[PDB]
Amino acid sequence: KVFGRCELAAAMKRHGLDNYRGYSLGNWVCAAKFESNFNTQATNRNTDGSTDYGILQINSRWWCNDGRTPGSRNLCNIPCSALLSSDITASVNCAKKIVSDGNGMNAWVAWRNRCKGTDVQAWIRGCRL
Ligand SMILES: [Cl-]
Ligand code: NA
């Protein structure tokens, strides 16, 4: 599923991400835009052989099991394919574990390079939330 901007903002809000660990909703919408272009089916392979999955491009080296990332952890305890669903629940629950891990949203490279320090409230402007 390819989400609309306000559709995704409302789904993330319902799942508890608005101000989760201090990060306003706009941060999460901005990250999803630049990680996956709001497409739950996005996948991208990394040089180390790991793969990034779903709307928030969660990585198989640490967070999910895809059966082909040797010596990986599965810290969200899920198959990576569960992160590609049109229901974002699994992605959100895993993201909450990631952002609690110590370096906050800097774990998402696109967030650090394209959202951090910008006017992220713009990503929820106009939405009925
Ligand atoms: Cl933080
Ligand atoms: Na893994």
UniProtKB/Swiss-Prot annotation:
Pfam families per record: Lys (PF00062)
Taxonomic superkingdom: Eukaryota
Enzyme Commission numbers on file: 3.2.1.17
Places the protein is found: Secreted
Keywords, comma-separated and alphabetical: Allergen, Antimicrobial, Bacteriolytic enzyme, Disulfide bond, Glycosidase, Hydrolase, Secreted, Signal
Any GO BP: killing of cells of another organism
Disulfide bond entries: 6-127, 30-115, 64-80, 76-94
Entry annotation: catalytic residues: 35, 52
Tissues and organs where the protein is expressed, per its UniProt entry: In the egg white and polymorphonuclear leukocytes.
GO molecular function, one term: identical protein binding
Database matches in SMART domains: LYZ1
Keyword Nucleotide-binding on entry: no
Chief subcellular location: secreted
Subunit structure: Monomer.
Family: Belongs to the glycosyl hydrolase 22 family.
Extra facts: Lysozyme C is capable of both hydrolysis and transglycosylation; it also shows a slight esterase activity. It acts rapidly on both peptide-substituted and unsubstituted peptidoglycan, and slowly on chitin oligosaccharides.
Chain's role: Lysozymes have primarily a bacteriolytic function; those in tissues and body fluids are associated with the monocyte-macrophage system and enhance the activity of immunoagents. Has bacteriolytic activity against M.luteus.
Annotated protein name in UniProt: Lysozyme C
Species of origin: Gallus gallus (Chicken)
Gene name of the record: LYZ
